[PDB]
């Protein structure tokens, strides 16, 4: 049992650029086996990360600044995580594939990091959907939090909780005369839940609880739930700030735990971005909820709370309700920072201004069927991700998506190249769809709260709701994806082709 609060909240380093001029900025990253020590008590760990880092270094760009970044597996030919090897059928293929994918990047579809785009160390062996070695990102989209991550076809789960994650943050110079709190008081956190073993190892299950003696060993689980809470790379640390104002990029990087987040003295954030980037006026919030793959920008105002050490709380169970001593925590501010200078910084009301003709309403399920060993396989609309594609949107046009969730729980959607706009969530009768596949709703449709009246490109679909969402699909046509974030839920089967059509 680890002791909260012992260790300072790791940084990352911003990456430095190989080569660089006014047309072109040139990045490379190396995937590579690493050890790190994750908390003052624990043996260091063997770790995957982005150029040797976990999180991986954050890369700041501009908007519109025209990035290449060359991906570069250097990993050992092995994994270390249990590889379940019946969820996906296929020459011999790697048993270590990886591709990065850009979260939130407005990206051409073969730089934006497709499953089956994979390649093993130094390339040897590609993808059938690989195109490329540097991937392109023109960076034309709203200032904002964005975040890269794995995304290989069947191993997305343990290639990110091996710890491929890290910060990309798009800045739109325009903004910067709102005067948000920026450069040091401008901070990344990456949340990632982990179960680590006393010899300072990742624990990540190679199968189910009471597992039949026939299931496959290893076998993918449902869901993920760690023991502890990391931020940037450590466990449950702290984080010195001064008496002012700081911009925080919460980022939720995390396998499935959805985060409930408040600060332990009752005090209030302001949000001032979502996913897709600033919203059009500030929101303040005593809590909010955060799912796989949701940002929120959020200021922090420490002036008032010189000396105090305050708690960022969390009120979300995974598989149970939440334990206060473990994962209630988050991590620990101490305001005891003397000022650099003086805060000069705003939280101001006005950030942005506010987010056509409907082309298209798509209608999709999200459900599950079982496969021979009794394991249940999630699906988006009852197709398999191998499947012929169904969702086809035609570029430059406006859609409605409406998400019919009759699981038992949420689950984060997330749809790649697009950000979109929330409309409703309406709550409807489960039994009566499953018997019949008749959808009678049983209430008014609810507007997204403020949290969701800007832009987003993941979004929790609650249990026994309809949600509704409208996105304009472009600038860029071809195959992409849409998907669950869980990423438990992801690799086994919930994720299918988006293509964006040009006739
Ligand atoms: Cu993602
Ligand atoms: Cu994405
Ligand atoms: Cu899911
Ligand atoms: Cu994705």
């Known amino acids: 049992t680890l002791e909260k609060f012992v260790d300072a909240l790791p940084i990352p380093d911003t990456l430095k650029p190989v080569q660089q001029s006014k047309e072109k ?38 908007r519109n600044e025209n990035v ?17 090897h019946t969820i996906h059928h296929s020459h011999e293929e790697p048993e270590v594939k990886t591709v990065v994918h850009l979260h939130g990047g407005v990206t051409p579809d073969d730089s934006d990091g497709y499953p089956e785009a994979w390649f ?15 991937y392109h990102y023109p960076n034309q989209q709203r200032g904002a939090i964005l975040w890269y991550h794995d995304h290989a076809m069947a191993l997305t789960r343990l290639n990110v909780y091996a710890g491929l994650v890290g910060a990309y943050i798009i800045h739109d110079p325009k903004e ?15 949340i990632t839940d982990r179960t680590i073993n006393e010899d300072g190892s990742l624990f990540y299950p190679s199968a189910p609880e009471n ?3 026939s299931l496959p060993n290893p076998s993918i689980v449902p869901a993920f739930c760690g023991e502890t809470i990391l931020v940037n ?11 002012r104002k700081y911009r925080f990029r919460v980022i939720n990087a995390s396998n499935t735990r959805t985060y409930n987040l408040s600060l332990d003295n009752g005090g209030d954030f302001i949000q001032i971005g979502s996913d897709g980037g600033l919203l059009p006026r500030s929101v303040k919030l005593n809590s909010f909820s955060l799912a796989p793959a949701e940002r929120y920008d959020i200021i922090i105002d420490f002036t008032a709370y010189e000396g105090e050490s305050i708690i960022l709380a969390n009120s979300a169970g995974c598989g149970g309700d939440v334990n206060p001593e473990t994962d209630a925590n988050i991590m620990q501010f101490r305001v005891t920072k003397p000022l650099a ?23 999709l399920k999200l459900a599950g069927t079982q496969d021979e060993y009794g394991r249940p396989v999630l699906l988006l609309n009852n197709k398999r991700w191998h499947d ?65 009246k800007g832009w987003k490109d993941t979004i929790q679909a609650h249990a026994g709701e309809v949600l509704r969402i409208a996105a304009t699909f472009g600038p860029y046509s071809g195959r992409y994806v849409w998907h669950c974030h869980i990423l438990e839920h992801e690799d086994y089967d919930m994720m299918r082709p988006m293509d964006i059509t040009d006739p």
């Open 68 to 84: 290449y970044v060359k991906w570069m597996n250097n990993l050992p030919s092995t994994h270390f995580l249990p590889i379940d």
């Open 211 to 213: 597992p039949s003696p």
């Open 341 to 363: 200078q003086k805060d000069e910084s705003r939280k101001p009301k006005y950030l942005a201004s506010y987010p056509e003709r409907i082309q298209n309403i798509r209608t």
């Open 25 to 62: 900025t040139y990045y490379e990253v190396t995937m590579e086996e690493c050890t790190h020590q994750l908390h003052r008590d624990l043996p260091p760990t063997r770790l995957w990360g982005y150029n040797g880092l976990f999180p991986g270094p954050t890369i700041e760009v501009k």
């Open 233 to 243: 790379g450590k466990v449950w640390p702290y984080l010195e700030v001064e008496p």
């Open 120 to 134: 093993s160390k130094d390339f040897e062996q590609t993808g059938p959907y690989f195109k490329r070695e540097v």
């Open 388 to 452: 012929p594609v169904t969702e086809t949107p035609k570029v430059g046009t406006t859609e409605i998506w409406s998400i019919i969730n009759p699981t038992r729980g949420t689950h984060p959607i997330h749809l790649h190249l697009v950000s979109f706009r929330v409309l409703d969530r309406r709550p409807f009768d489960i039994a009566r769809y499953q018997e019949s596949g008749e959808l009678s709703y049983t209430g008014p449709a609810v507007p997204p709260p403020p949290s969701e």
């Open 176 to 190: 910067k005369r709102l005067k948000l709190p920026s450069d040091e008081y401008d901070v990344p956190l990456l």
